[PDB]
Coordinates of C-alpha atoms in Angstrom, one line a residue:
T1 CA 1.4 10.2 -26.7
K2 CA 4.4 8.1 -26.6
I3 CA 3.4 6.4 -23.2
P4 CA 3.1 2.6 -24.1
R5 CA -0.2 0.9 -24.4
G6 CA -0.5 -2.1 -22.0
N7 CA 0.9 -5.4 -23.5
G8 CA -1.9 -7.8 -21.7
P9 CA -5.1 -8.9 -23.1
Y10 CA -7.4 -6.7 -21.1
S11 CA -8.5 -3.2 -22.3
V12 CA -7.6 -0.5 -19.7
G13 CA -9.9 2.2 -18.2
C14 CA -8.8 4.9 -15.5
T15 CA -10.8 7.2 -13.2
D16 CA -10.0 9.2 -10.0
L17 CA -11.1 8.7 -6.6
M18 CA -11.0 11.2 -3.5
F19 CA -12.7 10.1 -0.2
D20 CA -13.2 11.8 2.1
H21 CA -13.1 15.3 0.7
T22 CA -10.5 16.4 3.2
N23 CA -6.5 16.8 3.6
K24 CA -6.6 13.5 5.8
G25 CA -8.8 11.8 3.2
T26 CA -7.6 9.3 0.4
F27 CA -6.8 10.4 -3.3
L28 CA -5.9 7.7 -5.9
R29 CA -5.8 7.3 -9.6
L30 CA -7.6 4.0 -10.7
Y31 CA -6.1 2.0 -13.5
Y32 CA -8.5 -1.1 -14.2
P33 CA -9.5 -3.8 -16.8
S34 CA -11.9 -2.1 -19.1
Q35 CA -15.3 -3.6 -20.5
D36 CA -14.9 -1.5 -23.7
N37 CA -11.8 0.0 -25.5
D38 CA -13.6 2.9 -27.1
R39 CA -10.8 5.6 -27.1
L40 CA -7.5 6.2 -25.2
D41 CA -8.4 9.6 -23.9
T42 CA -7.3 9.8 -20.3
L43 CA -5.5 13.5 -19.7
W44 CA -1.9 12.6 -18.2
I45 CA -1.4 15.8 -16.2
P46 CA -4.9 17.2 -15.7
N47 CA -4.4 20.3 -13.8
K48 CA -2.1 23.5 -14.4
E49 CA -1.3 23.5 -10.6
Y50 CA 0.8 20.5 -11.1
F51 CA 3.0 22.2 -13.9
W52 CA 3.5 25.0 -11.4
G53 CA 4.5 22.2 -8.5
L54 CA 6.8 20.7 -11.1
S55 CA 8.4 23.9 -11.9
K56 CA 9.0 24.8 -8.2
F57 CA 10.5 20.8 -7.6
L58 CA 13.0 21.5 -10.6
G59 CA 14.2 24.8 -8.8
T60 CA 13.0 27.0 -11.9
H61 CA 10.7 30.0 -11.6
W62 CA 7.1 31.0 -13.0
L63 CA 8.0 30.9 -16.7
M64 CA 8.9 27.0 -17.0
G65 CA 5.5 26.1 -15.6
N66 CA 3.8 27.7 -18.5
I67 CA 6.3 26.2 -20.9
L68 CA 5.8 22.6 -19.4
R69 CA 2.1 23.2 -19.6
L70 CA 2.5 24.3 -23.2
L71 CA 4.5 21.3 -24.1
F72 CA 2.5 18.6 -22.0
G73 CA -0.9 20.4 -21.0
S74 CA -2.9 18.1 -23.7
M75 CA -0.8 15.0 -23.6
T76 CA -2.9 11.9 -23.1
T77 CA -2.0 8.5 -21.8
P78 CA -3.5 5.3 -23.3
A79 CA -6.4 4.5 -21.2
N80 CA -10.2 4.8 -21.5
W81 CA -11.2 7.7 -19.2
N82 CA -14.4 6.6 -17.0
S83 CA -14.7 3.4 -19.0
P84 CA -17.1 0.9 -17.2
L85 CA -15.2 -1.9 -15.0
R86 CA -15.1 -5.2 -16.7
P87 CA -17.4 -7.4 -14.8
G88 CA -17.7 -11.1 -13.6
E89 CA -14.0 -11.5 -12.1
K90 CA -12.4 -10.4 -8.9
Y91 CA -9.0 -8.7 -9.6
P92 CA -5.6 -8.5 -7.6
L93 CA -4.8 -5.0 -6.4
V94 CA -1.7 -3.0 -6.4
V95 CA -1.4 0.0 -4.3
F96 CA 1.3 2.3 -6.0
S97 CA 3.2 5.1 -4.3
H98 CA 5.0 7.9 -6.4
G99 CA 8.5 9.5 -5.5
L100 CA 9.5 13.0 -4.6
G101 CA 8.3 15.7 -6.8
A102 CA 5.8 13.4 -8.4
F103 CA 2.1 12.6 -8.0
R104 CA -0.5 10.1 -8.8
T105 CA -0.7 10.2 -12.6
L106 CA 3.2 10.2 -13.4
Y107 CA 3.7 6.2 -13.3
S108 CA 0.8 5.5 -15.8
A109 CA 3.2 3.3 -18.2
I110 CA 3.4 0.9 -14.9
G111 CA -0.3 1.1 -14.0
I112 CA -1.7 0.7 -17.4
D113 CA 0.5 -2.2 -18.1
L114 CA -0.4 -4.1 -14.8
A115 CA -4.2 -3.3 -15.6
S116 CA -4.2 -4.6 -18.9
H117 CA -2.8 -7.9 -17.3
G118 CA -5.9 -8.0 -15.1
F119 CA -5.0 -5.8 -12.0
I120 CA -6.8 -2.9 -10.3
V121 CA -4.1 -0.4 -9.5
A122 CA -4.5 2.5 -7.1
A123 CA -2.0 5.1 -7.5
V124 CA -2.1 7.3 -4.4
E125 CA -1.5 11.0 -4.1
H126 CA 0.4 11.7 -1.0
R127 CA -0.6 14.7 1.1
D128 CA 2.9 14.7 3.1
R129 CA 4.3 17.5 0.8
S130 CA 6.4 15.1 -1.1
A131 CA 4.1 15.4 -4.2
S132 CA 5.2 18.5 -6.6
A133 CA 1.4 19.3 -6.1
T134 CA -1.8 18.0 -4.7
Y135 CA -5.2 18.9 -3.7
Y136 CA -8.3 18.5 -1.2
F137 CA -11.4 20.4 -0.2
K138 CA -12.0 22.5 2.7
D139 CA -15.9 21.1 3.0
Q140 CA -18.4 19.3 1.1
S141 CA -19.8 22.6 -0.5
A142 CA -16.1 23.1 -1.8
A143 CA -16.0 19.7 -3.2
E144 CA -19.6 20.2 -5.1
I145 CA -18.2 23.4 -6.6
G146 CA -14.8 22.0 -7.5
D147 CA -13.3 24.8 -5.4
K148 CA -9.7 23.0 -5.0
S149 CA -7.2 23.8 -2.1
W150 CA -3.6 23.3 -3.5
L151 CA -0.7 21.9 -1.5
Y152 CA 2.8 22.2 -2.9
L153 CA 6.0 20.3 -2.2
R154 CA 8.0 21.4 1.0
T155 CA 11.5 22.5 0.4
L156 CA 13.7 21.0 3.4
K157 CA 16.9 22.7 5.1
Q158 CA 19.7 19.7 5.6
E159 CA 19.3 20.0 9.4
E160 CA 15.6 18.7 9.5
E161 CA 16.2 16.2 6.4
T162 CA 16.7 13.1 8.8
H163 CA 13.6 13.9 10.8
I164 CA 11.0 15.0 8.3
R165 CA 11.9 12.2 5.6
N166 CA 11.1 9.9 8.3
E167 CA 7.7 11.5 9.3
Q168 CA 6.8 11.6 5.5
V169 CA 7.6 8.0 4.9
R170 CA 5.3 7.1 8.3
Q171 CA 2.5 9.3 6.7
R172 CA 3.0 7.8 3.2
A173 CA 2.6 4.3 4.7
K174 CA -0.5 5.4 6.4
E175 CA -1.8 6.8 2.9
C176 CA -1.1 3.6 1.3
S177 CA -3.0 1.5 4.2
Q178 CA -6.1 4.2 4.2
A179 CA -6.3 4.0 0.2
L180 CA -6.3 0.1 0.7
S181 CA -9.2 0.3 3.5
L182 CA -11.1 2.7 1.0
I183 CA -11.0 0.3 -1.7
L184 CA -11.8 -3.1 0.4
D185 CA -14.8 -1.1 2.2
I186 CA -16.2 -0.2 -1.4
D187 CA -15.6 -4.0 -2.5
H188 CA -17.6 -4.8 0.5
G189 CA -20.5 -2.3 -0.1
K190 CA -19.6 0.9 1.8
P191 CA -21.5 3.6 0.1
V192 CA -19.0 6.4 -0.9
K193 CA -19.8 10.0 -2.5
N194 CA -16.7 10.5 -4.6
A195 CA -15.5 14.1 -3.9
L196 CA -15.1 14.4 -7.7
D197 CA -18.0 14.3 -10.0
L198 CA -17.0 11.7 -12.6
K199 CA -19.3 9.4 -15.0
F200 CA -17.5 6.2 -13.3
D201 CA -20.0 4.7 -10.8
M202 CA -17.7 3.5 -7.7
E203 CA -20.7 1.0 -7.1
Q204 CA -19.1 -0.9 -10.0
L205 CA -16.1 -1.8 -7.6
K206 CA -18.6 -3.9 -5.3
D207 CA -17.1 -7.5 -5.1
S208 CA -14.5 -6.7 -7.8
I209 CA -11.5 -7.2 -5.7
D210 CA -9.6 -10.4 -4.9
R211 CA -8.8 -9.6 -1.1
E212 CA -6.0 -12.1 -0.7
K213 CA -4.1 -10.9 -3.5
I214 CA -2.7 -7.2 -2.5
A215 CA 0.7 -5.9 -3.5
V216 CA 2.3 -2.4 -2.7
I217 CA 4.7 -1.1 -5.5
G218 CA 6.6 2.3 -5.5
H219 CA 9.3 4.2 -7.0
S220 CA 12.1 6.0 -5.1
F221 CA 10.6 7.7 -2.1
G222 CA 7.8 5.4 -3.2
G223 CA 10.1 2.3 -2.7
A224 CA 10.9 3.3 0.8
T225 CA 7.1 3.6 1.2
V226 CA 6.8 -0.2 -0.1
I227 CA 9.1 -1.2 2.9
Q228 CA 7.4 0.8 5.6
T229 CA 3.8 -0.2 4.4
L230 CA 4.8 -3.8 4.6
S231 CA 6.4 -3.5 8.0
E232 CA 3.1 -1.9 9.3
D233 CA 0.3 -3.8 7.5
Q234 CA 0.2 -7.7 6.5
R235 CA -2.9 -7.2 4.3
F236 CA -0.1 -6.2 1.7
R237 CA 1.3 -9.7 0.9
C238 CA 4.2 -8.6 -1.0
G239 CA 6.3 -5.5 -2.2
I240 CA 8.2 -4.2 -5.2
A241 CA 10.4 -1.1 -4.5
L242 CA 11.6 0.4 -8.0
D243 CA 14.9 2.1 -7.3
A244 CA 14.1 2.5 -3.7
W245 CA 15.7 5.5 -1.9
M246 CA 16.3 4.1 1.5
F247 CA 17.3 7.3 3.5
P248 CA 13.9 8.0 5.0
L249 CA 13.7 4.5 7.0
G250 CA 14.4 3.9 10.6
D251 CA 16.7 0.8 11.6
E252 CA 13.7 -0.7 13.3
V253 CA 11.9 -1.4 10.0
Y254 CA 14.5 -3.8 8.5
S255 CA 13.5 -6.7 11.1
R256 CA 9.9 -6.4 10.8
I257 CA 9.0 -7.3 7.0
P258 CA 7.8 -11.0 6.6
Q259 CA 6.4 -10.4 3.1
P260 CA 8.5 -11.1 0.0
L261 CA 10.2 -8.0 -1.3
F262 CA 11.7 -7.0 -4.9
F263 CA 14.1 -4.5 -5.7
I264 CA 14.1 -3.4 -9.3
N265 CA 17.1 -1.0 -9.5
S266 CA 18.4 1.5 -12.3
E267 CA 22.1 0.6 -13.5
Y268 CA 22.8 4.6 -13.3
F269 CA 20.9 5.7 -9.9
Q270 CA 22.4 3.2 -7.1
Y271 CA 25.1 4.1 -4.7
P272 CA 26.7 2.0 -1.7
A273 CA 24.8 3.8 1.1
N274 CA 21.5 3.1 -0.4
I275 CA 22.4 -0.7 -1.5
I276 CA 23.8 -1.7 2.1
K277 CA 20.2 -0.7 3.4
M278 CA 18.4 -2.9 0.8
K279 CA 21.1 -5.7 1.9
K280 CA 20.0 -5.2 5.5
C281 CA 16.6 -6.4 4.5
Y282 CA 18.3 -10.0 3.5
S283 CA 17.6 -13.0 5.8
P284 CA 17.4 -16.7 5.1
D285 CA 13.9 -16.9 6.5
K286 CA 12.6 -14.2 4.0
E287 CA 12.3 -13.8 -0.1
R288 CA 14.4 -11.1 -1.3
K289 CA 14.9 -10.7 -4.9
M290 CA 17.2 -7.8 -6.6
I291 CA 17.8 -7.1 -10.3
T292 CA 19.4 -4.0 -12.1
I293 CA 18.2 -2.6 -15.5
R294 CA 21.4 -2.3 -17.6
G295 CA 21.7 1.2 -19.3
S296 CA 18.8 2.8 -17.2
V297 CA 18.6 6.0 -15.2
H298 CA 16.3 6.7 -12.2
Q299 CA 13.6 8.4 -14.4
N300 CA 13.1 5.0 -16.6
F301 CA 10.7 4.1 -14.0
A302 CA 8.3 7.2 -14.5
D303 CA 6.3 8.7 -17.4
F304 CA 8.7 11.6 -18.1
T305 CA 11.1 9.0 -19.8
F306 CA 8.4 8.9 -22.7
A307 CA 7.7 12.8 -23.0
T308 CA 10.7 13.8 -24.9
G309 CA 12.7 12.6 -27.9
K310 CA 16.1 10.5 -27.7
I311 CA 18.6 13.2 -27.6
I312 CA 16.6 15.7 -25.2
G313 CA 15.8 12.6 -23.1
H314 CA 19.7 12.0 -22.6
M315 CA 20.6 15.6 -22.0
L316 CA 17.9 15.9 -19.4
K317 CA 18.5 12.5 -17.6
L318 CA 15.0 11.3 -18.4
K319 CA 16.3 8.4 -20.5
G320 CA 19.4 6.2 -20.5
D321 CA 21.3 4.2 -23.1
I322 CA 18.7 1.6 -22.9
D323 CA 15.3 2.1 -25.0
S324 CA 12.6 3.6 -22.6
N325 CA 10.1 0.8 -23.8
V326 CA 12.6 -1.7 -23.3
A327 CA 13.5 -0.9 -19.9
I328 CA 9.7 -0.6 -18.6
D329 CA 8.8 -3.9 -20.3
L330 CA 11.5 -5.5 -18.2
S331 CA 10.6 -3.8 -15.0
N332 CA 6.8 -4.7 -15.7
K333 CA 7.4 -8.3 -16.7
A334 CA 9.6 -8.9 -14.0
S335 CA 7.0 -7.4 -11.6
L336 CA 4.3 -9.7 -13.1
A337 CA 6.3 -13.0 -12.7
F338 CA 7.0 -11.9 -8.9
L339 CA 3.3 -10.8 -8.5
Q340 CA 2.4 -14.4 -9.9
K341 CA 4.8 -16.2 -7.6
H342 CA 3.9 -14.4 -4.3
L343 CA 0.0 -13.6 -4.8
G344 CA -0.5 -17.2 -6.2
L345 CA -2.0 -16.0 -9.6
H346 CA -3.3 -18.5 -12.2
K347 CA -1.9 -16.7 -15.3
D348 CA 1.3 -17.1 -17.8
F349 CA 3.5 -14.6 -15.9
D350 CA 5.8 -17.4 -14.9
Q351 CA 7.3 -17.3 -18.4
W352 CA 9.4 -14.2 -17.1
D353 CA 10.4 -15.9 -13.9
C354 CA 14.0 -15.8 -15.7
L355 CA 13.8 -12.0 -15.4
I356 CA 13.6 -12.2 -11.6
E357 CA 17.1 -13.8 -11.6
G358 CA 18.5 -11.2 -13.9
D359 CA 18.7 -13.6 -16.9
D360 CA 18.5 -11.2 -19.9
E361 CA 21.1 -9.1 -22.0
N362 CA 19.5 -6.0 -20.4
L363 CA 19.4 -7.5 -16.7
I364 CA 22.2 -7.7 -14.1
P365 CA 21.4 -10.1 -11.4
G366 CA 21.5 -8.3 -7.9
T367 CA 23.5 -5.1 -8.3
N368 CA 26.7 -3.5 -10.1
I369 CA 27.4 -2.1 -6.5
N370 CA 28.3 -5.7 -5.3

């Protein structure tokens, strides 16, 4: 793998939680501070149906699914699969929301970095038909046999794009809120039968969460999800929207977000109709920060920026002019300073306070669109 290891002092583990087993239950990948750093063996894209889903998203046919699976089917991401939770402290929690055509495992560079700095991160899989694929179980017996029911991205007609994208962002916000409720309930002793049979005992999460230090983070469709979630759910104390795609949001949302909100944009994705909606969030009674990463494209926030070499990266728009490792470091470090500021963490993340103001060779303060 070329997906970077976490830069923080904690070793990082990974597992999957589905509860309840149904299409209305919560599904998330958990990245967390590990007790042991035994081996970096987590499978990046762990089922073949996700390659079929990716293929349908990219508008290709049956054959490209099998090529992507041949290329990436065994690629790992640097986290200890089912490693025990590091005991004796309460961790801040991030709920993470993926963009259109993605699913829970494709922001491991972001999730492993936050975990290596002492966060638990819950990367949610959406059941809104925005994921390229996702699964659930029709009953408890199906969950015991591993007899998965698959759900693939919904292709939309232009006529319905406004209505359905707004219905999707509302469901997505409900899913971020449900996932938070699952983790907080486990933190306070709710017994849960994970619908997946994994060596990670969810009991370990008992009294492991710092309940006042909760953030929501998301990319693209996920950035819109950040804003919807903040508007509905004051348990989320701040939001970080990575290249927010603002189109799905209703105008009622902009006046309802008291929490601090951070926009981290790619230089090469943003456009005036998008930026104006970001600027409708600004108000002298609210904390809003915006930076742009110089030489970055949309995909610099996701794991596919690390999946290919420099030249094929640029050809496919998975990489920009900036180094993929340098982009994600600026994103993760800026995020850490912001989470230290607005969650009241007692760490050294304030060293990167300058990246929040866009003070780096590789950052623009605010936006090039200005």
